[PDB]
């Protein structure tokens, strides 16, 4: 029975509005409703992995698991295995997988982050799950960010706290946050970004929604504008939105948006918004294709509609050779030529690199680089041809060309990372000097760039 080179992943996010669900929620898992929807001919084909994020979830873990499993069993006639479940307050994540994957999944981690301080600590934050699926690392984050149209900068701060402090994936990747630890990272939830238009325009917005004319609304969506301005979710992708705003509905219908200020809302307006979102970030040149992104039309217990997204995702096998794992394969090597880091820092410490990869027995520290002044004020750290030759555990090109090298540039004075990035080994040629490039980030913000050339030797 061959190991897969692709899987499909279902991501759901639903703010349940503290109400129990209706008796039937199958439309959610079938990607049916509005937006980019799944073809009917696929309805009985199970996804490999289902990741369900809820917010304002009033159910126990047991109660929700029973509903989810019975829902999937009805669609697919498969009894899914529970990989992980984790709840912070009323924010929950459930991962379910086909039983045939049970012995492909390992290294399961869960964590949560509570956002805010005093007043603002006690209901918002995030939960996450990570695991290995054969040779591929997968991370999943469900966040419930700060509410309210005038709090976009708080949401952005919530995002940075979650990616700094959520402890998932391989703890040996010490310089790297969750935005670098996984082959594929899915980040979803009630992100709570709003359509930034005047309150007076509420009825005009409703009109536009009834006409399925979303362009003049999406151009004011805070998440799209903040992402464009590099304020949040740097280097994440989102499918185009082609479904109506998923908040704020009158319960028990979808015919009415409930936007007007009420005592129950703290006298705040809730103009129709795309609060409920799915984004992802995958390592360079790894297959990932969004095959659905939409909202259900028939689940009406909450003031939000559920959102679904599904993905094809490339996966790799747990590779064994005669040599690695447990030794190097002298027929393999990775060389960096003429490499330099450009850093936004004002600091004047010396810097060194660390190379981390599961194709290495352990991470590799470089010598210090040579600091020069860039023309437009910046720090350029030159490595020349000084970088250590990396010795992969396996030389087979079917394995090595699918790997990645994480790079951290660290201060010699403090050993703190000033920037992290990632280089794919999925090269156009072996035994050939080829350009490489990654942006560098720290705490998920842009801090610089790393560029140079690579020369990869495989057994072929
Ligand atoms: C509503 C539902 C529930 C469980 C499984 C499938 C479906 C809809 N799919 C379907 N019905 N007839 N043909 N097809 C493709």
UniProtKB/Swiss-Prot annotation:
The keyword Coiled coil does not apply. Changing residue 288 to E: In one patient with acute myeloid leukemya; somatic mutation. Keywords: Apoptosis, Cell membrane, Cytoplasm, Cytoskeleton, Hydrolase, Immunity, Lipid metabolism, Membrane, Phosphoprotein, Repeat, SH2 domain, SH3-binding. Its main location: cytoplasm. GO terms for cellular component: cytoplasm; cytoskeleton; cytosol; membrane raft; plasma membrane. GO terms for biological process: apoptotic process; determination of adult lifespan; immunoglobulin mediated immune response; intracellular signal transduction; negative regulation of B cell proliferation; negative regulation of bone resorption; negative regulation of interleukin-6 production; negative regulation of monocyte differentiation. GO terms for molecular function: inositol-1,3,4,5-tetrakisphosphate 5-phosphatase activity; inositol-polyphosphate 5-phosphatase activity; phosphatidylinositol-3,4,5-trisphosphate 3-phosphatase activity; phosphatidylinositol-3,4,5-trisphosphate 5-phosphatase activity; phosphatidylinositol-4,5-bisphosphate 5-phosphatase activity; SH3 domain binding. Tyrosine phosphorylated by the members of the SRC family after exposure to a diverse array of extracellular stimuli such as cytokines, growth factors, antibodies, chemokines, integrin ligands and hypertonic and oxidative stress. Phosphorylated upon IgG receptor FCGR2B-binding. Specifically expressed in immune and hematopoietic cells. Expressed in bone marrow and blood cells. Levels vary considerably within this compartment. Present in at least 74% of immature CD34+ cells, whereas within the more mature population of CD33+ cells, it is present in only 10% of cells. Present in the majority of T-cells, while it is present in a minority of B-cells (at protein level). It is found in: Cytoplasm; Cell membrane; Membrane raft; Cytoplasm, Cytoskeleton. It comes from the Eukaryota. The keyword ATP-binding does not apply. Interacts with tyrosine phosphorylated form of SHC1. Interacts with tyrosine phosphorylated form of DOK1. Interacts with tyrosine phosphorylated form of DOK3. Interacts with tyrosine phosphorylated form of SLAMF1/CD150. Interacts with PTPN11 in response to IL-3. Interacts with receptor EPOR. Interacts with receptors MS4A2/FCER1B and FCER1G. Interacts with receptors FCGR2B and FCGR3. Interacts with receptor FCGR2A, leading to regulate gene expression during the phagocytic process. Interacts with GRB2. Interacts with PLCG1. Interacts with tyrosine kinases SRC and TEC. Interacts with c-Met/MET. Belongs to the inositol 1,4,5-trisphosphate 5-phosphatase family. Phosphatidylinositol (PtdIns) phosphatase that specifically hydrolyzes the 5-phosphate of phosphatidylinositol-3,4,5-trisphosphate (PtdIns(3,4,5)P3) to produce PtdIns(3,4)P2, thereby negatively regulating the PI3K (phosphoinositide 3-kinase) pathways. Able also to hydrolyzes the 5-phosphate of phosphatidylinositol-4,5-bisphosphate (PtdIns(4,5)P3) and inositol 1,3,4,5-tetrakisphosphate. Acts as a negative regulator of B-cell antigen receptor signaling. The SH2 domain interacts with tyrosine phosphorylated forms of proteins such as SHC1 or PTPN11/SHP-2. It competes with that of GRB2 for binding to phosphorylated SHC1 to inhibit the Ras pathway. It is also required for tyrosine phosphorylation. This is Phosphatidylinositol 3,4,5-trisphosphate 5-phosphatase 1. It comes from Homo sapiens (Human).
């Amino acid at each position: 029975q061959p190991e897969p080179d692709m899987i499909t992943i279902f991501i759901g996010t639903w703010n349940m509005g503290n109400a129990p669900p209706p008796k039937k929620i199958t439309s959610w898992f079938l990607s049916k409703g509005q937006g980019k929807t799944r073809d009917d001919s696929a309805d009985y084909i199970p996804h490999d992995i289902y990741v369900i994020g809820t917010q304002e979830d009033p159910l126990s873990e047991k109660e929700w698991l029973e509903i989810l499993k019975h829902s999937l069993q009805e669609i697919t006639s498969v009894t899914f295995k529970t990989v992980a479940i984790h709840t912070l307050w009323n924010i929950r994540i459930v991962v379910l997988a086909k039983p045939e994957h049970e012995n492909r999944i390992s290294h399961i981690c869960t964590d949560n982050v509570k956002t805010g301080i005093a007043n603002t600590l006690g209901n918002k934050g995030a939960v996450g799950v990570s695991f290995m699926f054969n040779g591929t690392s997968l991370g999943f984050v469900n966040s419930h960010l700060t509410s309210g149209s005038e709090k976009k900068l708080r949401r952005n701060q919530n995002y940075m706290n979650i990616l700094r402090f959520l402890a998932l994936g391989d703890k040996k990747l010490s310089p790297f946050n969750i935005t670098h630890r996984f082959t594929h990272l899915f980040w979803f939830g009630d992100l709570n970004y709003r359509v930034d238009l005047p309150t007076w325009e509420a009825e005009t917005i409703i009109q536009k929604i009834k006409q399925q004319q979303y362009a003049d609304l999406l151009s004011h969506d805070q998440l799209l504008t903040e992402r464009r301005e590099q304020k949040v979710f740097l280097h994440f992708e989102e499918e185009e939105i082609t479904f109506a705003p998923t908040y704020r509905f009158e319960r028990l219908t979808r015919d009415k948006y409930a936007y007007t200020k009420q005592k129950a809302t703290g006298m705040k307006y809730n103009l129709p918004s795309w609060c409920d979102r799915v984004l992802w970030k995958s390592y360079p040149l790894v297959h990932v294709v969004c095959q659905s992104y939409g909202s259900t039309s028939d689940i009406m217990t909450s003031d939000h509609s559920p959102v679904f997204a599904t993905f094809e995702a490339g996966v790799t096998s747990q590779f064994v050779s005669k040599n690695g794992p447990g030794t190097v394969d002298s027929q393999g090597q990775i060389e960096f030529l003429r490499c330099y880091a450009t850093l936004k820092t004002k600091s004047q410490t010396k810097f060194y690199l660390e190379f981390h990869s599961s194709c290495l027995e352990s991470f590799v520290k470089s010598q210090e680089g040579e600091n020069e002044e860039g023309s437009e004020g910046e720090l350029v750290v030159k490595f020349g041809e000084t970088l250590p030759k990396l010795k992969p555990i396996i030389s087979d090109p079917e394995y090595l060309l699918d790997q990645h090298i994480l790079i951290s540039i660290k201060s010699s004075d403090s050993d703190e990372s000033y920037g992290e990035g990632c280089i794919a080994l999925r090269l156009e040629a072996t035994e050939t000097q080829l350009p490489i490039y990654t942006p560098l980030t720290h705490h998920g913000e842009l801090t610089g760039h790393f560029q140079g050339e690579i020369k990869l030797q495989t057994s072929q």
